[PDB]
Amino acid sequence: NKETDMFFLAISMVGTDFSMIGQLFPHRARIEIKNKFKREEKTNGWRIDKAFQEKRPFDFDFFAHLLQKVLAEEEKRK
Amino acid sequence: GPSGIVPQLQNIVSTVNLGCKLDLKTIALRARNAEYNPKRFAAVIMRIREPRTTALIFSSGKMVCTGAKSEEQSRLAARKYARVVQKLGFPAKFLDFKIQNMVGSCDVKFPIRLEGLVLTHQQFSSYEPELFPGLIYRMIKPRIVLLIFVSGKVVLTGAKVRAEIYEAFENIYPILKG
């Protein structure tokens, strides 16, 4: 669930763009992200539309740290 | 005559010249939508949903876009990326828009025995059931390449307008029937 939320969130920050999220995701390839998008477009189209109208910024720093903290939290809680 | 089923277009391919130099690293730094993986390839690939399309940009100032269901939709998406690049801080222009390719598909709702087609059409139809399950046919008028399957569904590609797809469809339809 968390990974899906973050895939969405990055799709809003880095757009419908996959190689960079694969790069920042420790263990995801671009084909993986493309497949996530195929699977999710059928149901979450409205959220992906929410992904292209707000101008909140993107980073490595604030984000890289946010990724690592939420992944550690999820792994310790899962 | 027509069987009552129209060929629906599945894809559109188009390109336009941006007319200026761009820095891919700058785009990846600023735009909320960008790649730059020079270790694999030095380019930036876009995509938007309205229209549903994917575009790709270079430092050389060219754009290639694809994914729409209609040519006008493809042009709309192209102009959207042109607007994005213009507001990215680049002096982009929407110059020399050209449509490259489109894909369509249809069906005939009756089974297709590929063996007869290859036996009567081998000179332009290539049948090889070992690697590619379907049958390959290349058409001259217009320059269309066609894929045919037992289920009766057909994939059409290589055109520039939907009229070519329809005309090739009705050219082949009597052959498909018998």
PDB file of C-alpha atoms in Angstrom:
ATOM      1  CA  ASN A   1       0.000   0.000   0.000  1.00  0.00           C
ATOM      2  CA  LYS A   2       2.692   2.474   0.971  1.00  0.00           C
ATOM      3  CA  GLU A   3       4.696   1.800  -2.191  1.00  0.00           C
ATOM      4  CA  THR A   4       1.593   2.476  -4.292  1.00  0.00           C
ATOM      5  CA  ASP A   5       0.965   5.771  -2.494  1.00  0.00           C
ATOM      6  CA  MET A   6       4.577   6.822  -3.090  1.00  0.00           C
ATOM      7  CA  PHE A   7       4.410   5.790  -6.749  1.00  0.00           C
ATOM      8  CA  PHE A   8       1.430   8.131  -7.064  1.00  0.00           C
ATOM      9  CA  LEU A   9       3.135  10.892  -5.098  1.00  0.00           C
ATOM     10  CA  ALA A  10       6.242  10.783  -7.292  1.00  0.00           C
ATOM     11  CA  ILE A  11       4.041  10.660 -10.404  1.00  0.00           C
ATOM     12  CA  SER A  12       2.793  14.040  -9.205  1.00  0.00           C
ATOM     13  CA  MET A  13       6.284  15.354  -8.378  1.00  0.00           C
ATOM     14  CA  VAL A  14       8.331  13.882 -11.266  1.00  0.00           C
ATOM     15  CA  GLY A  15       5.269  13.397 -13.442  1.00  0.00           C
ATOM     16  CA  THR A  16       4.526  10.388 -15.598  1.00  0.00           C
ATOM     17  CA  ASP A  17       8.276   9.707 -15.684  1.00  0.00           C
ATOM     18  CA  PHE A  18       9.739   6.360 -14.684  1.00  0.00           C
ATOM     19  CA  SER A  19      13.534   6.080 -14.971  1.00  0.00           C
ATOM     20  CA  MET A  20      14.217   8.659 -12.244  1.00  0.00           C
ATOM     21  CA  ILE A  21      11.779   7.037  -9.812  1.00  0.00           C
ATOM     22  CA  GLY A  22      13.393   3.698 -10.619  1.00  0.00           C
ATOM     23  CA  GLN A  23      16.753   5.320  -9.859  1.00  0.00           C
ATOM     24  CA  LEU A  24      15.609   6.761  -6.524  1.00  0.00           C
ATOM     25  CA  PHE A  25      13.627   3.620  -5.688  1.00  0.00           C
ATOM     26  CA  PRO A  26      16.308   1.246  -4.344  1.00  0.00           C
ATOM     27  CA  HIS A  27      15.130  -1.839  -6.261  1.00  0.00           C
ATOM     28  CA  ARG A  28      12.693  -0.873  -9.064  1.00  0.00           C
ATOM     29  CA  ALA A  29      13.413  -0.884 -12.800  1.00  0.00           C
ATOM     30  CA  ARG A  30      11.705   1.283 -15.411  1.00  0.00           C
ATOM     31  CA  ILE A  31       9.765  -1.666 -16.842  1.00  0.00           C
ATOM     32  CA  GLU A  32       8.452  -2.274 -13.326  1.00  0.00           C
ATOM     33  CA  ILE A  33       7.141   1.292 -13.048  1.00  0.00           C
ATOM     34  CA  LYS A  34       5.601   1.058 -16.512  1.00  0.00           C
ATOM     35  CA  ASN A  35       3.790  -2.105 -15.405  1.00  0.00           C
ATOM     36  CA  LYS A  36       2.561  -0.400 -12.223  1.00  0.00           C
ATOM     37  CA  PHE A  37       1.166   2.357 -14.433  1.00  0.00           C
ATOM     38  CA  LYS A  38      -0.613  -0.116 -16.723  1.00  0.00           C
ATOM     39  CA  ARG A  39      -2.209  -1.773 -13.702  1.00  0.00           C
ATOM     40  CA  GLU A  40      -3.206   1.415 -11.884  1.00  0.00           C
ATOM     41  CA  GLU A  41      -4.490   3.527 -14.793  1.00  0.00           C
ATOM     42  CA  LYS A  42      -7.695   1.461 -14.951  1.00  0.00           C
ATOM     43  CA  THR A  43      -8.872   2.475 -11.457  1.00  0.00           C
ATOM     44  CA  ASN A  44      -6.872   5.474 -10.175  1.00  0.00           C
ATOM     45  CA  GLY A  45      -7.201   7.685 -13.261  1.00  0.00           C
ATOM     46  CA  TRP A  46      -8.737  10.432 -11.129  1.00  0.00           C
ATOM     47  CA  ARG A  47      -5.721  10.479  -8.816  1.00  0.00           C
ATOM     48  CA  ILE A  48      -3.299  10.579 -11.748  1.00  0.00           C
ATOM     49  CA  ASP A  49      -5.340  13.557 -12.980  1.00  0.00           C
ATOM     50  CA  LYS A  50      -4.769  15.110  -9.553  1.00  0.00           C
ATOM     51  CA  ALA A  51      -1.090  14.530 -10.379  1.00  0.00           C
ATOM     52  CA  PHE A  52      -1.015  17.306 -13.071  1.00  0.00           C
ATOM     53  CA  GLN A  53      -2.549  20.476 -11.662  1.00  0.00           C
ATOM     54  CA  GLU A  54      -0.599  21.442  -8.489  1.00  0.00           C
ATOM     55  CA  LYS A  55       2.877  22.989  -8.388  1.00  0.00           C
ATOM     56  CA  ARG A  56       4.394  21.607  -5.183  1.00  0.00           C
ATOM     57  CA  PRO A  57       8.183  21.317  -5.586  1.00  0.00           C
ATOM     58  CA  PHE A  58      10.369  18.250  -6.046  1.00  0.00           C
ATOM     59  CA  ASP A  59      13.764  17.411  -4.544  1.00  0.00           C
ATOM     60  CA  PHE A  60      16.288  14.770  -3.980  1.00  0.00           C
ATOM     61  CA  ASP A  61      17.047  16.006  -0.487  1.00  0.00           C
ATOM     62  CA  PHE A  62      13.702  16.529   1.236  1.00  0.00           C
ATOM     63  CA  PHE A  63      12.334  13.627  -0.772  1.00  0.00           C
ATOM     64  CA  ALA A  64      15.276  11.221  -0.509  1.00  0.00           C
ATOM     65  CA  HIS A  65      15.019  11.690   3.267  1.00  0.00           C
ATOM     66  CA  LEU A  66      11.222  11.306   3.198  1.00  0.00           C
ATOM     67  CA  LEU A  67      11.531   8.077   1.197  1.00  0.00           C
ATOM     68  CA  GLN A  68      14.098   6.588   3.563  1.00  0.00           C
ATOM     69  CA  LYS A  69      12.170   7.535   6.704  1.00  0.00           C
ATOM     70  CA  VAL A  70       8.840   6.165   5.451  1.00  0.00           C
ATOM     71  CA  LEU A  71      10.465   2.985   4.079  1.00  0.00           C
ATOM     72  CA  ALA A  72      12.196   2.338   7.408  1.00  0.00           C
ATOM     73  CA  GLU A  73       8.923   3.015   9.229  1.00  0.00           C
ATOM     74  CA  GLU A  74       6.934   0.701   6.946  1.00  0.00           C
ATOM     75  CA  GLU A  75       9.541  -2.063   7.113  1.00  0.00           C
ATOM     76  CA  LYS A  76       9.706  -1.919  10.917  1.00  0.00           C
ATOM     77  CA  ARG A  77       5.897  -1.817  11.211  1.00  0.00           C
ATOM     78  CA  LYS A  78       5.054  -4.363   8.489  1.00  0.00           C
TER      79      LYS A  78
ATOM     80  CA  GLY B   1     -19.760  -3.868 -48.489  1.00  0.00           C
ATOM     81  CA  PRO B   2     -18.800  -2.920 -44.935  1.00  0.00           C
ATOM     82  CA  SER B   3     -19.379  -5.586 -42.289  1.00  0.00           C
ATOM     83  CA  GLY B   4     -20.659  -2.988 -39.802  1.00  0.00           C
ATOM     84  CA  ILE B   5     -17.341  -2.812 -37.906  1.00  0.00           C
ATOM     85  CA  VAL B   6     -15.108   0.230 -38.420  1.00  0.00           C
ATOM     86  CA  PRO B   7     -11.310   0.209 -37.903  1.00  0.00           C
ATOM     87  CA  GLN B   8     -10.628   1.993 -34.609  1.00  0.00           C
ATOM     88  CA  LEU B   9      -7.317   3.840 -34.407  1.00  0.00           C
ATOM     89  CA  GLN B  10      -5.124   2.766 -31.491  1.00  0.00           C
ATOM     90  CA  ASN B  11      -2.067   5.026 -31.808  1.00  0.00           C
ATOM     91  CA  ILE B  12      -0.770   8.225 -33.384  1.00  0.00           C
ATOM     92  CA  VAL B  13       2.841   9.294 -33.973  1.00  0.00           C
ATOM     93  CA  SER B  14       3.833  12.916 -34.557  1.00  0.00           C
ATOM     94  CA  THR B  15       6.874  15.183 -34.343  1.00  0.00           C
ATOM     95  CA  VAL B  16       7.502  18.932 -34.279  1.00  0.00           C
ATOM     96  CA  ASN B  17      10.603  21.126 -34.324  1.00  0.00           C
ATOM     97  CA  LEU B  18      11.025  23.211 -31.172  1.00  0.00           C
ATOM     98  CA  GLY B  19      13.347  25.626 -32.968  1.00  0.00           C
ATOM     99  CA  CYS B  20      15.887  26.206 -30.195  1.00  0.00           C
ATOM    100  CA  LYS B  21      18.678  24.656 -28.174  1.00  0.00           C
ATOM    101  CA  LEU B  22      17.676  23.064 -24.869  1.00  0.00           C
ATOM    102  CA  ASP B  23      19.587  21.674 -21.898  1.00  0.00           C
ATOM    103  CA  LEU B  24      18.286  18.267 -20.840  1.00  0.00           C
ATOM    104  CA  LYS B  25      19.938  18.635 -17.430  1.00  0.00           C
ATOM    105  CA  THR B  26      18.117  21.940 -16.904  1.00  0.00           C
ATOM    106  CA  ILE B  27      14.790  20.325 -17.830  1.00  0.00           C
ATOM    107  CA  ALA B  28      15.421  17.462 -15.404  1.00  0.00           C
ATOM    108  CA  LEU B  29      16.359  20.041 -12.755  1.00  0.00           C
ATOM    109  CA  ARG B  30      13.271  22.250 -13.187  1.00  0.00           C
ATOM    110  CA  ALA B  31      10.331  20.426 -14.788  1.00  0.00           C
ATOM    111  CA  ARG B  32       8.064  18.343 -12.551  1.00  0.00           C
ATOM    112  CA  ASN B  33       8.167  15.767 -15.377  1.00  0.00           C
ATOM    113  CA  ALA B  34      11.493  14.622 -16.811  1.00  0.00           C
ATOM    114  CA  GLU B  35      14.123  11.946 -17.179  1.00  0.00           C
ATOM    115  CA  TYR B  36      17.835  12.310 -17.642  1.00  0.00           C
ATOM    116  CA  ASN B  37      19.622   8.959 -17.525  1.00  0.00           C
ATOM    117  CA  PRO B  38      22.687   9.669 -19.695  1.00  0.00           C
ATOM    118  CA  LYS B  39      24.287   6.442 -18.463  1.00  0.00           C
ATOM    119  CA  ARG B  40      21.582   4.699 -20.525  1.00  0.00           C
ATOM    120  CA  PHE B  41      20.415   7.449 -22.895  1.00  0.00           C
ATOM    121  CA  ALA B  42      20.712  11.250 -22.926  1.00  0.00           C
ATOM    122  CA  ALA B  43      17.103  12.300 -23.426  1.00  0.00           C
ATOM    123  CA  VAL B  44      13.916  13.419 -21.673  1.00  0.00           C
ATOM    124  CA  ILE B  45      10.558  11.661 -22.140  1.00  0.00           C
ATOM    125  CA  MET B  46       7.221  13.347 -21.342  1.00  0.00           C
ATOM    126  CA  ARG B  47       3.685  12.060 -21.017  1.00  0.00           C
ATOM    127  CA  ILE B  48       0.260  13.568 -20.350  1.00  0.00           C
ATOM    128  CA  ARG B  49      -3.234  12.093 -20.056  1.00  0.00           C
ATOM    129  CA  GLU B  50      -5.299  14.799 -21.803  1.00  0.00           C
ATOM    130  CA  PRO B  51      -4.438  13.783 -24.517  1.00  0.00           C
ATOM    131  CA  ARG B  52      -3.128  10.342 -23.453  1.00  0.00           C
ATOM    132  CA  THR B  53       0.330  10.539 -25.002  1.00  0.00           C
ATOM    133  CA  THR B  54       4.077  10.232 -24.466  1.00  0.00           C
ATOM    134  CA  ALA B  55       6.614  12.680 -25.866  1.00  0.00           C
ATOM    135  CA  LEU B  56      10.394  12.717 -25.992  1.00  0.00           C
ATOM    136  CA  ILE B  57      12.721  15.719 -26.148  1.00  0.00           C
ATOM    137  CA  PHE B  58      16.382  16.252 -27.042  1.00  0.00           C
ATOM    138  CA  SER B  59      18.927  19.011 -26.621  1.00  0.00           C
ATOM    139  CA  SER B  60      18.863  19.341 -30.429  1.00  0.00           C
ATOM    140  CA  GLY B  61      15.427  21.008 -30.358  1.00  0.00           C
ATOM    141  CA  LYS B  62      13.256  18.226 -31.812  1.00  0.00           C
ATOM    142  CA  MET B  63      10.119  16.689 -30.315  1.00  0.00           C
ATOM    143  CA  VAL B  64       8.651  13.243 -30.949  1.00  0.00           C
ATOM    144  CA  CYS B  65       5.208  12.514 -29.514  1.00  0.00           C
ATOM    145  CA  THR B  66       2.991   9.444 -29.629  1.00  0.00           C
ATOM    146  CA  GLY B  67       0.053   7.779 -27.929  1.00  0.00           C
ATOM    147  CA  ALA B  68      -3.079   9.635 -28.983  1.00  0.00           C
ATOM    148  CA  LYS B  69      -6.136   8.042 -30.583  1.00  0.00           C
ATOM    149  CA  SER B  70      -6.533  10.853 -33.154  1.00  0.00           C
ATOM    150  CA  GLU B  71      -4.118  13.032 -35.105  1.00  0.00           C
ATOM    151  CA  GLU B  72      -5.682  16.251 -33.833  1.00  0.00           C
ATOM    152  CA  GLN B  73      -5.389  14.945 -30.271  1.00  0.00           C
ATOM    153  CA  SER B  74      -1.710  14.248 -30.937  1.00  0.00           C
ATOM    154  CA  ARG B  75      -1.260  17.827 -32.152  1.00  0.00           C
ATOM    155  CA  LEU B  76      -3.022  19.112 -29.028  1.00  0.00           C
ATOM    156  CA  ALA B  77      -0.646  17.162 -26.792  1.00  0.00           C
ATOM    157  CA  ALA B  78       2.273  18.448 -28.874  1.00  0.00           C
ATOM    158  CA  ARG B  79       1.170  22.042 -28.308  1.00  0.00           C
ATOM    159  CA  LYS B  80       0.769  21.279 -24.601  1.00  0.00           C
ATOM    160  CA  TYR B  81       4.404  20.186 -24.347  1.00  0.00           C
ATOM    161  CA  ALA B  82       5.357  23.249 -26.396  1.00  0.00           C
ATOM    162  CA  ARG B  83       3.598  25.419 -23.804  1.00  0.00           C
ATOM    163  CA  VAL B  84       5.339  23.516 -20.996  1.00  0.00           C
ATOM    164  CA  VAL B  85       8.760  24.099 -22.551  1.00  0.00           C
ATOM    165  CA  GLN B  86       7.946  27.758 -23.207  1.00  0.00           C
ATOM    166  CA  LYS B  87       7.101  28.218 -19.526  1.00  0.00           C
ATOM    167  CA  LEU B  88      10.163  26.119 -18.615  1.00  0.00           C
ATOM    168  CA  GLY B  89      12.214  29.175 -19.603  1.00  0.00           C
ATOM    169  CA  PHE B  90      13.082  28.003 -23.128  1.00  0.00           C
ATOM    170  CA  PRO B  91      12.079  30.006 -26.249  1.00  0.00           C
ATOM    171  CA  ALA B  92      10.227  27.062 -27.778  1.00  0.00           C
ATOM    172  CA  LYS B  93       8.143  27.279 -30.947  1.00  0.00           C
ATOM    173  CA  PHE B  94       5.629  24.892 -32.515  1.00  0.00           C
ATOM    174  CA  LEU B  95       7.220  24.697 -35.963  1.00  0.00           C
ATOM    175  CA  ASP B  96       7.019  22.032 -38.684  1.00  0.00           C
ATOM    176  CA  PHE B  97       4.487  19.682 -37.142  1.00  0.00           C
ATOM    177  CA  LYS B  98       4.573  16.343 -38.967  1.00  0.00           C
ATOM    178  CA  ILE B  99       2.543  13.164 -38.466  1.00  0.00           C
ATOM    179  CA  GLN B 100       4.652  10.012 -38.747  1.00  0.00           C
ATOM    180  CA  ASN B 101       2.551   6.894 -38.098  1.00  0.00           C
ATOM    181  CA  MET B 102      -0.640   5.523 -36.571  1.00  0.00           C
ATOM    182  CA  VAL B 103      -1.975   2.105 -35.574  1.00  0.00           C
ATOM    183  CA  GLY B 104      -5.493   0.738 -35.956  1.00  0.00           C
ATOM    184  CA  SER B 105      -7.353  -2.524 -35.482  1.00  0.00           C
ATOM    185  CA  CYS B 106     -10.609  -4.192 -36.510  1.00  0.00           C
ATOM    186  CA  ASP B 107     -12.360  -7.566 -36.643  1.00  0.00           C
ATOM    187  CA  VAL B 108     -14.451  -9.674 -39.015  1.00  0.00           C
ATOM    188  CA  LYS B 109     -16.148 -12.044 -36.510  1.00  0.00           C
ATOM    189  CA  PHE B 110     -15.336 -15.243 -38.400  1.00  0.00           C
ATOM    190  CA  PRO B 111     -12.398 -17.654 -38.102  1.00  0.00           C
ATOM    191  CA  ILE B 112      -9.433 -17.271 -40.440  1.00  0.00           C
ATOM    192  CA  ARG B 113      -7.596 -20.279 -41.889  1.00  0.00           C
ATOM    193  CA  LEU B 114      -4.129 -18.837 -42.477  1.00  0.00           C
ATOM    194  CA  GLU B 115      -3.039 -21.804 -44.606  1.00  0.00           C
ATOM    195  CA  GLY B 116      -5.273 -20.869 -47.535  1.00  0.00           C
ATOM    196  CA  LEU B 117      -4.181 -17.238 -47.332  1.00  0.00           C
ATOM    197  CA  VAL B 118      -0.502 -18.155 -47.488  1.00  0.00           C
ATOM    198  CA  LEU B 119      -1.169 -20.699 -50.252  1.00  0.00           C
ATOM    199  CA  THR B 120      -2.897 -18.050 -52.398  1.00  0.00           C
ATOM    200  CA  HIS B 121      -0.973 -14.936 -51.292  1.00  0.00           C
ATOM    201  CA  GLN B 122       2.579 -16.066 -50.442  1.00  0.00           C
ATOM    202  CA  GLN B 123       4.040 -13.469 -52.819  1.00  0.00           C
ATOM    203  CA  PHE B 124       3.044 -10.722 -50.346  1.00  0.00           C
ATOM    204  CA  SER B 125       1.920 -12.712 -47.271  1.00  0.00           C
ATOM    205  CA  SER B 126       4.568 -14.222 -44.988  1.00  0.00           C
ATOM    206  CA  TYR B 127       3.311 -17.081 -42.807  1.00  0.00           C
ATOM    207  CA  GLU B 128       5.508 -18.547 -40.083  1.00  0.00           C
ATOM    208  CA  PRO B 129       3.640 -20.147 -37.153  1.00  0.00           C
ATOM    209  CA  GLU B 130       6.798 -21.013 -35.189  1.00  0.00           C
ATOM    210  CA  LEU B 131       7.891 -17.633 -33.777  1.00  0.00           C
ATOM    211  CA  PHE B 132       5.134 -15.098 -34.504  1.00  0.00           C
ATOM    212  CA  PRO B 133       1.686 -16.671 -33.992  1.00  0.00           C
ATOM    213  CA  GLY B 134      -0.047 -14.527 -36.621  1.00  0.00           C
ATOM    214  CA  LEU B 135       0.350 -13.931 -40.344  1.00  0.00           C
ATOM    215  CA  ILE B 136       2.230 -10.974 -41.848  1.00  0.00           C
ATOM    216  CA  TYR B 137       0.982  -9.172 -44.963  1.00  0.00           C
ATOM    217  CA  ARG B 138       2.561  -6.077 -46.533  1.00  0.00           C
ATOM    218  CA  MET B 139       0.234  -3.984 -48.707  1.00  0.00           C
ATOM    219  CA  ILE B 140       1.362  -1.614 -51.458  1.00  0.00           C
ATOM    220  CA  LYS B 141      -1.686   0.657 -51.937  1.00  0.00           C
ATOM    221  CA  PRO B 142      -1.133   2.465 -49.594  1.00  0.00           C
ATOM    222  CA  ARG B 143       2.174   1.535 -47.899  1.00  0.00           C
ATOM    223  CA  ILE B 144       0.521  -0.518 -45.151  1.00  0.00           C
ATOM    224  CA  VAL B 145       1.712  -3.532 -43.157  1.00  0.00           C
ATOM    225  CA  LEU B 146      -1.030  -5.837 -41.888  1.00  0.00           C
ATOM    226  CA  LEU B 147      -1.206  -8.533 -39.205  1.00  0.00           C
ATOM    227  CA  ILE B 148      -3.913 -11.201 -39.438  1.00  0.00           C
ATOM    228  CA  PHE B 149      -4.948 -13.817 -36.883  1.00  0.00           C
ATOM    229  CA  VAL B 150      -7.270 -16.805 -36.696  1.00  0.00           C
ATOM    230  CA  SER B 151      -9.701 -14.967 -34.412  1.00  0.00           C
ATOM    231  CA  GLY B 152     -10.458 -12.573 -37.285  1.00  0.00           C
ATOM    232  CA  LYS B 153      -8.981  -9.454 -35.689  1.00  0.00           C
ATOM    233  CA  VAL B 154      -6.544  -7.460 -37.830  1.00  0.00           C
ATOM    234  CA  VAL B 155      -3.931  -4.841 -36.913  1.00  0.00           C
ATOM    235  CA  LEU B 156      -3.111  -2.096 -39.423  1.00  0.00           C
ATOM    236  CA  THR B 157      -0.076   0.183 -39.416  1.00  0.00           C
ATOM    237  CA  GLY B 158       2.098   2.291 -41.697  1.00  0.00           C
ATOM    238  CA  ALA B 159      -0.472   4.866 -42.828  1.00  0.00           C
ATOM    239  CA  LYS B 160      -0.617   8.635 -42.381  1.00  0.00           C
ATOM    240  CA  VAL B 161      -4.407   9.179 -42.148  1.00  0.00           C
ATOM    241  CA  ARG B 162      -7.459   7.214 -41.039  1.00  0.00           C
ATOM    242  CA  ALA B 163      -8.733   7.236 -44.628  1.00  0.00           C
ATOM    243  CA  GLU B 164      -5.818   5.002 -45.625  1.00  0.00           C
ATOM    244  CA  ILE B 165      -6.699   2.596 -42.808  1.00  0.00           C
ATOM    245  CA  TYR B 166     -10.344   2.408 -43.886  1.00  0.00           C
ATOM    246  CA  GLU B 167      -9.450   1.989 -47.553  1.00  0.00           C
ATOM    247  CA  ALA B 168      -6.935  -0.787 -46.841  1.00  0.00           C
ATOM    248  CA  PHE B 169      -9.536  -2.439 -44.608  1.00  0.00           C
ATOM    249  CA  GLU B 170     -12.127  -2.530 -47.388  1.00  0.00           C
ATOM    250  CA  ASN B 171      -9.463  -3.622 -49.889  1.00  0.00           C
ATOM    251  CA  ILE B 172      -8.601  -6.662 -47.772  1.00  0.00           C
ATOM    252  CA  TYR B 173     -12.155  -7.457 -46.595  1.00  0.00           C
ATOM    253  CA  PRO B 174     -13.170  -9.442 -49.723  1.00  0.00           C
ATOM    254  CA  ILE B 175      -9.933 -11.417 -49.403  1.00  0.00           C
ATOM    255  CA  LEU B 176     -10.720 -12.171 -45.759  1.00  0.00           C
ATOM    256  CA  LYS B 177     -14.251 -13.263 -46.656  1.00  0.00           C
ATOM    257  CA  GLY B 178     -12.954 -15.550 -49.413  1.00  0.00           C
TER     258      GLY B 178
END
